[PDB]
Amino acid sequence: LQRRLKRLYPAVDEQETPLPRSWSPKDKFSYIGLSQNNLRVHYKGHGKTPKDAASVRATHPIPAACGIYYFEVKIVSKGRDGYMGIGLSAQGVNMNRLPGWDKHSYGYHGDDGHSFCSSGTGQPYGPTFTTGDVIGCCVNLINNTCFYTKNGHSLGIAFTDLPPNLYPTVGLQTPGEVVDANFGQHPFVFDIEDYMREW
Numbered sequence: 001l002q003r004r005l006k007r008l009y010p011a012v013d014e015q016e017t018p019l020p021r022s023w024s025p026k027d028k029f030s031y032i033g034l035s036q037n038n039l040r041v042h043y044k045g046h047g048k049t050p051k052d053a054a055s056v057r058a059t060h061p062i063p064a065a066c067g068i069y070y071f072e073v074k075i076v077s078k079g080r081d082g083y084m085g086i087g088l089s090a091q092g093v094n095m096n097r098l099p100g101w102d103k104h105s106y107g108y109h110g111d112d113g114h115s116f117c118s119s120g121t122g123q124p125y126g127p128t129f130t131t132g133d134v135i136g137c138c139v140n141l142i143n144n145t146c147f148y149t150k151n152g153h154s155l156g157i158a159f160t161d162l163p164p165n166l167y168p169t170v171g172l173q174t175p176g177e178v179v180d181a182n183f184g185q186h187p188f189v190f191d192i193e194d195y196m197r198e199w
Helices: 004-008 192-197
Strands: 023-028 032-035 040-043 054-058 068-078 085-089 105-109 114-117 134-140 145-150 153-159 167-172 177-182
Touching: 004 192, 023 032, 032 054, 040 167, 054 085, 068 192, 085 134, 085 145, 105 153, 105 167, 114 153, 134 192, 167 177
Parallel strands: none
Antiparallel strands: 023 054, 032 040, 040 177, 054 167, 068 134, 068 177, 085 105, 085 167, 105 114, 134 145, 145 153
């Protein structure tokens, strides 16, 4: 019997740098609700406009000693419009936003498939995504890059020159949106171990 996070991240001393295992009940915007042992994220805002965007960060930033880090998000419901972003953010970045809208945050959004790099204009990146889809986010801490995956297959490199100490982040914007995180306690759809083996 292997311990899943210890197999994935053998060099990480969690007494020093704990791994993110769930969403933070404190480090989140008021419009985000949590359920399922803090793994399920529910939009509970007004949903009318971008001023109602709402994000949540994981409990802990990604330890550098992971080497390569990975998490997956299942779209349980796209709600009204599926304005859902998945990515990374530094400590204290404004959470009344979708990931990538503000500096020091990075996102891939489901409605347009665009990538959003630290407040930069949305760029074509990947496919759209919606109810049923699994989207993964892989951070290569060694070469400072991030790429996403969709239903087990890799997309391209999204971001380069990434700073460290980033937190897994999801943001939602319309009523009924619901997503579930896998931080490594369930098998991943993407063959992350195959990617890692080469690093």
